[PDB]
Amino acid sequence: GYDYDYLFKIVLIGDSGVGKSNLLSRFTTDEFNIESKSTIGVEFATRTIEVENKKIKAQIWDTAGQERYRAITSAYYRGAVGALIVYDISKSSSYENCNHWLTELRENADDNVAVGLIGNKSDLAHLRAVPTDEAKNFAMENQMLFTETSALNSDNVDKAFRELIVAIFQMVSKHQVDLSGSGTNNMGSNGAPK
Amino acid sequence: YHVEASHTSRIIVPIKKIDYKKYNFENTPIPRIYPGRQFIQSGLNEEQTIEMRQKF
């Protein structure tokens, strides 16, 4: 059937050409029967983990920037609870508007979100457009999880997703107690009197 | 020499040249005092890097 317990939606946001979609395909189920990207914009991918003996279903919506869909993207951040700003260390002008993406996403997403920040294409570490310690600091006074992804090793990004779903889980972890259902008696022949 | 309170005195120091086939002046440029650091892109043209190396 379906049988999962919770379902989160997590946007991937950034500038175009920073390498979000190639980052998405390697670590998660992909190319199921999705028509494509740009036909409607913002492709959807799914990931199924379990936390604390609860099953979690996560939908990742890699936002697409083409200027034409800018009005459409606003409506797609409505209700968005998990977030990931991706930036590349090779090019440098994405980091000038990474703060703008954070501002636009603090606006009209939820009451509270948990935004990660991830450096794609660390295979070109020598070509470092921005120092990692500055982005690490900018994550530190913005309450953000910070990652550096090789794009050739998927362990880092997979670890980031597991910890992000943990922090967003405890945030919404509704209290649960028990569903045991063992209390049985009263098998008589009913000498009733009304 | 003698310089009193404002009087400049241009010292004329004679030296020789240097030989371009004796020293290489295209070696690792502007060496850092301590090794390591961020290792960010230079952000300058290779030709500019040549003249900055010579002028240092």
UniProtKB/Swiss-Prot annotation, chain A:
It is a lipid-anchor. GO terms for biological process: autophagy; early endosome to Golgi transport; exocytosis; protein transport; vesicle-mediated transport. Alternates between an inactive form bound to GDP and an active form bound to GTP. Activated by the guanine nucleotide-exchange factor (GEF) TRAPP complex, and inactivated by GTPase-activating protein (GAP) GYP3. Residues 180-191 have a biased composition (Low complexity). GO terms for cellular component: cellular bud neck; cytosol; endosome; Golgi apparatus; Golgi membrane; mitochondrial outer membrane; recycling endosome. The gene is YPT32. PANTHER family: DRAB11-RELATED (PTHR47979). SMART domains: RAB, RAN, RAS, RHO. Changing residue 43 to Q: Cold sensitive. It comes from the Eukaryota. Interacts with YIF1, YIP3, YIP4 and YIP5. Interacts with the GEF SEC2. Interacts with TRS130. It is found in: Golgi apparatus membrane. Pfam families: Ras. Present with 4298 molecules/cell in log phase SD medium. SUPFAM superfamilies: P-loop containing nucleoside triphosphate hydrolases (SSF52540). Belongs to the small GTPase superfamily. Rab family. This is GTP-binding protein YPT32/YPT11. InterPro entries: P-loop_NTPase, Rab_GTPases_membrane_traffic, Small_GTP-bd, Small_GTPase. Keywords: Acetylation, Autophagy, Exocytosis, Golgi apparatus, GTP-binding, Lipoprotein, Membrane, Nucleotide-binding, Prenylation, Protein transport, Transport. Required for protein transport through the secretory pathway. Probably involved in regulation of secretory vesicle formation at the trans-Golgi compartment. Mediates the proper polarized localization of SEC2, a GEF for SEC4, but does not alter the exchange activity of SEC2 on SEC4. Plays a role in autophagy. A motif (Effector region) lies at residues 36-44. One of its GO terms (molecular function) is GTPase activity. GTP binds at residues 14-21, 62-66, 120-123.
UniProtKB/Swiss-Prot annotation, chain B:
Transmembrane segments: none annotated. It comes from the Eukaryota. It is found in: Golgi apparatus, cis-Golgi network. Part of the multisubunit TRAPP (transport protein particle) II complex composed of BET3, BET5, TRS20, TRS23, TRS31, TRS33, TRS65, TRS120 and TRS130. Interacts directly with TRS65. Belongs to the TRS120 family. Specific subunit of the TRAPP II complex, a highly conserved vesicle tethering complex that functions in the late Golgi as a guanine nucleotide exchanger (GEF) for the Golgi YPT1 GTPase. TRS120 plays a role in the YPT GEF activity of TRAPP II in concert with the two other TRAPP II-specific subunits TRS65 and TRS130. Present with 259 molecules/cell in log phase SD medium. This is Trafficking protein particle complex II-specific subunit 120. It comes from Saccharomyces cerevisiae (strain ATCC 204508 / S288c). The gene is TRS120.
